[PDB]
Amino acid sequence: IVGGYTCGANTVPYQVSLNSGYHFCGGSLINSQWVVSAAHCYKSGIQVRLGEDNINVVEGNEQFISASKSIVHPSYNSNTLNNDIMLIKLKSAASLNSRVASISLPTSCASAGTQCLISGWGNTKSSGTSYPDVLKCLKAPILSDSSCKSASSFIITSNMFCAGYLEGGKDSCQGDSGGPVVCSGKLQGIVSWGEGCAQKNKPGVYTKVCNYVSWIKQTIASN
Ligand SMILES: COC(=O)[C@H](Cc1cccc(C(=N)N)c1)NC(=O)CNS(=O)(=O)c1ccc(C)cc1
Ligand SMILES: [Ca+2]
């Protein structure tokens, strides 16, 4: 997260860390046994860490659970990152509480100008590198599709949306991928891609979750 603020211990209870010997992507807990992340975060031997704040220090509210099955979206295109969404099922159900809680799926798609919460343990520098140990947060509004294309020249699909500031300075970054974008109390996006970080006229691009609710529900009810 570039230009954000320290969230505060366990203030984002649905935020998860994907670990394969080290943190490599974020994700969101949608129920006691399922996690949603980005398909480009796919990897074998994934361990899900819940209740995390400082990812390098056992603080007491963590739950480390191995994944038993990973399901990348059937139409994921790694070249364009269209349909950049993936489902991860935990070996055993997590114990839900104040510090470990699920986030609800949307019933409608968020609209332009809506303020959302983006979070992750990603890089905090637009130039160079600096990775934080604690969870960072950022408030950012959804942008209109035309305004996004006009300024960035990005080729967006109907399964993506832009959020951030055309002025630059604030944005998600390397390592935040797979993480949550929450608006109106529901999971509306997944950190997917961008061009550099916090660059002017180059806002972040996120997977539009409201288009995948049906797929998610059907997959979870049968796996
Ligand atoms: C990979 O290194 C980076 O600094 C960022 C990471 C990132 C990830 C998710 C969201 C954001 C964000 N801005 N909100 C940033 N991505 C890039 O800079 C990738 N763009 S790119 O122009 O470098 C590029 C384009 C196409 C290919 C095949 C490879 C690389
Ligand atoms: Ca910890």
Looking from the CA of residue 202, the nearest atom of ligand 1 is 13
Residues 148 and 48 in one domain: no
**How distant, in Å, are the alpha carbons of 44, 71, 98, 159, 216 from that of 181?**
25, 20, 20, 14, 17
The residue segments making up the domain with residue 147 are: 1-12+103-210
Q: Are 136 and 4 in contact (CB under 8 A)?
A: yes
User: Dihedral of CA 181/24/136/35: which sign?
Assistant: positive
Number of domains in the chain: 2
Helix (H) or strand (E) run with residue 203 in it: none
Q: Tokens for 208? A: 């539009």
Q: Do 196 and 148 touch, CB atoms closer than 8 A?
A: no
**Backbone angle region of 32, left / alpha / beta, with phi > 0 → left and psi within -120 to 50 → alpha:** alpha
Residue 190's DSSP bridge partners are: 180, 207
Same domain, 124 and 84: no
| 3 state SS of 49 | strand
Radius of gyration of the chain (CA): 16
Q: Are residues 54 and 125 in the same domain?
A: no
Query: Residue holding tokens 């211990």?
Result: 9
d(CA 173, CA 127) in angstroms, rounded, equals: 11
From first CA to last CA, the distance across the chain in angstroms is 33
User: Which two tokens mark 112?
Assistant: 């332009």
CA distance 99 to 40: 27
Contact indicator for 212, 73 with CB cutoff of 8 Å: yes
Q: How many CB atoms lie within 10 A of CB 208?
A: 23
- Whether 116 and 201 map to the same domain: the answer is yes
Which residue owns the Cα nearest ligand 1 atom 25? 195
CATH number of the domain at 53, please.
2.40.10.10
The reply to whether ligand 1 has any atom less than 6 angstroms from the CB of 177 is yes
Q: Do 47 and 74 fall into the same domain?
A: yes
DSSP string across 56-73: TS--S--EEEEEEEEEE-
Hey, what amino acid is at 108?
Answer: S
Q: Is residue 47 located within the same domain as residue 93?
A: yes
- Phi first, then psi, for residue 150 (nearest 5°) are -55, -50
Residues 54 and 158 in one domain: no
Experimental method: X-ray
What SS3 class is residue 190? strand
Same domain, 134 and 116: yes
Residues 6+ apart with CB under 8 A from 113: 141, 142
Cβ of 10 below 6 Å from ligand 1: no
What is the strand order of the sheet 186-193 is part of? Answer: 5-6, 136-141, 115-120, 180-183, 186-193, 204-208, 160-163
Residues 162 and 125 in one domain: yes
- Cα distances from 21 to residues 104, 138, 149, 165, 198, in angstroms, run 29, 27, 38, 34, 28
C-alpha–C-alpha distance, residues 138 and 204, integer Å = 12
Question: Does the active-site annotation cover 177?
Answer: yes
Is 84 among the residues known to form the active site?
yes
3-state secondary structure 118-185: EEECCCCCCCCCCCCCCCEEEEEEECCHHHHHHHHCCCCCCCEEEECCCCCCCECCCCCCCCEEEECC
